[model samples]
Target: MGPVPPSTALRELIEELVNITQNQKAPLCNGSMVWSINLTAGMYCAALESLINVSGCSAIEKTQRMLSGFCPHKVSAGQFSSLHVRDTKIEVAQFVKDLLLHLKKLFREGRFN
Candidate 1:
């Protein structure tokens, strides 16, 4: 399969982030105000790391570590992308996808098989 476009990948990641955080009752906080999108992205990144390990996706370890260092909590804000809030989540998600795809291709091509 071809690589997914960056914007499209970010949207998908954001959508999933929204869902997981909403379900967990985590409130998105931006400068003391509640913002669901930010909270959702943070929660989603955390959950993604957990799920990645449990699912036996070895590629997720480094990705999870990288993401964790970027934003460990919903309230913690940083300038990850052009947009300040929840930008790191988008970066990490696309990064993980690309890494996994590369690994898959490498294995298939007898690079590691």
Candidate 2:
């Protein structure tokens, strides 16, 4: 398995971000809390694998699928930062939004170029 063009993948991720973050009515993924992945590493597949643990969340369905095409490699959680979003009643939607924002910054810095 290989990775897709970073630029194109980022663009598609942003599009999914828009759909999932707007007018959200309920808690995403049943208010599931996943590890706070370090998106700065540009490991979309690893992130996808982590997020894939969440089920029945239609909002992020596309985002997860899109990530599948970004990177086909599986990165262990310990391979990168092993921190998580500590308990504070944080929603998965919010977490996903933050991840996307950081990604946007990295993209602007030409980190994915």
Candidate 3:
């Protein structure tokens, strides 16, 4: 394996995000609603849950913390991606994938961010 590609690791997870993307929305600069593409809290409960779930804050700690519907992590303290989601792992996975799929649309645009 020539350095396990991130795309491969996040492939299935992205699929999950795509599925839920349809249900999310956010405010655009044009005063209109758009897909919640960014990591905006306006997305959904589980969607935010997913990002925090894959946090550098260490899934080990996040998992236990998630029990109360929170992801309180300080990545600056030094922690990175961890594939754990405590109770509703699958649910949170969908949330993350939803946002990622929307972000995927941005990448397909073929431009710099």
Candidate 4:
């Protein structure tokens, strides 16, 4: 089967995640975590049709390496500790929601430069 297109729900979730990254100061770590997750997910989704191939593996690995650099705490904290958002799937979900909300506001305000 072909990979499914990102659902409206997923798009909305990503928007929220962007929002969080753009507008939040509290839990400073949240912003990066959300961005990393969303970006990684986006790449993975885009490559889903070929995800079983070597190229797919390389893409995922590169994306993950980039994510690791963006959220170094994840690597240090074992990916589940309070230091990183990737520890739990639920946290990843929350991060995405926050990001989307943040981005939505930015777009509404014409914050693009």
Candidate 5:
């Protein structure tokens, strides 16, 4: 009754993010930083575009590659430069946790398009 087309890969990504969010003890990617992203259906690509900049995080390398496939074409036209976070230092771990939580809701509610 759920999970069709792009849903399968998205579910897998969600689970992967969830697993890392809970299991990791140390800060992720040596506490590497990325721009904080607001996740919506259109924002998946935006998220990845920013996430792609994080270098040398072997932990999330797979996650990065997985995100690469989600947006076959750049849906990120003019969608960036609007997301802002002030005085917020967001670590990769925290970002992943937030992303996983949002994705869980998206998956359960069939919001992925």
Candidate 6:
């Protein structure tokens, strides 16, 4: 199951954040809780989410790929996290929702560029 495709401009922005977030990763640990994407998830999401109502990507899907491709704040490079997003079946929709509305206004006003 995939999300709907967004506009071209929206797609570009959404893709950009994934690349950006992919660079931000937590350290490898046997049993540790270092960080949580810092604040970049919403930072990128605002720009991405505001650009369109759909981006063929859910926060979980994008985040899931990141966890696999990046450190994932657990046993880095091993796999998914234990006390992590997927492991815990956590949802980032609420966080994304808040950021979405504000950015949508900002983007609409062309003040968020």
> For residues 7-95, could you state the per-residue lDDT of candidate 2 as single tens digits?
76787678768776786777767778765565556557546656756678777777766766666654453443233544243467777
lDDT of 6 by residue, 84-110 (tens): 432221123433334334434444545
lDDT of each: 0.37, 0.66, 0.36, 0.35, 0.70, 0.35
Residue by residue across 53-104, what tens digits does model 3's lDDT show? 2433332243333222323343321333332333323343343445555545
> What lDDT tens digits, residue by residue, belong to model 5 across residues 1-113?
75357778888788778777777788877778877766667556767767666778788778766776766654243454424555354787777777777776777877675
Tens digit of per-residue lDDT, candidate 1, span 23-55: 643222221221222223244354433334233
**C-alpha lDDT of candidate 6 relative to the true structure:** 0.35
Off by over 4 Å in 4: 1-90
Clashing pairs in 5: none
Ranking by lDDT: 5, 2, 1, 3, 4, 6
Q: Count the backbone clashes (under 3 Å) in each candidate.
A: 1, 0, 4, 17, 0, 0
Strongest candidate by TM-score: 5
- Cα-based TM-score, every candidate: 0.26, 0.68, 0.25, 0.26, 0.75, 0.27
**Model number with the top lDDT:** 5
Residue by residue across 1-113, what tens digits does model 4's lDDT show?
76333343344444444564457555433322222333322333322212222222231344344333323333321122222343323333354354445434444554321
Task: Summing lDDT over every window of 10 consecutive residues in candidate 4, give the lowest-scoring window.
Answer: 46-55
Better model by TM-score: candidate 1 vs candidate 4: 1
RMSD for each of the candidates: 14.0, 4.4, 13.4, 13.8, 4.3, 13.9
Per the 3 Å backbone cut-off, how many clashing residue pairs does candidate 2 have?
A: 0
